[PDB]
């Protein structure tokens, strides 16, 4: 009930890897390498948030 819980907590952060968070997709550097610099500012703002 400690250790697995922490793993689940870490697994929770694992599920925070591939979330859109209002952005187009969860992939960072492809959106950094496809769109406008202010568009990428908006997307990375959403992702960092």
């Amino acid at each position: 009930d400690v250790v697995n819980q922490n793993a689940q907590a870490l697994n929770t952060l694992v599920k925070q890897l591939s979330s859109n968070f209002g952005a187009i997709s969860s992939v960072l550097n492809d959106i950094l390498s496809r769109l406008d610099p202010p568009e990428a500012e908006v997307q990375i703002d959403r992702l960092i948030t």
């Binding site: 406008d36 610099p37 202010p38």
Partner: protein
């Protein structure tokens, strides 16, 4: 319509680009009545490549 932070083209790739933190203004207006010539005024030149 190319002078913008994040755009490219005849202006921002060749000779005149804005920085990413443009703390200025954009004002333009027509003065064709002092540059109109029938055969063409070719004293003013630009960059293509």
């Amino acid at each position: 319509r190319q002078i913008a932070p994040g755009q490219t083209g005849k202006i921002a790739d060749y000779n005149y680009k804005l920085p990413d933190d443009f703390t200025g203004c954009v004002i333009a207006w027509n003065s064709n009545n002092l540059d109109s010539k029938v055969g063409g005024n070719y004293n003013y030149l630009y960059r293509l490549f």
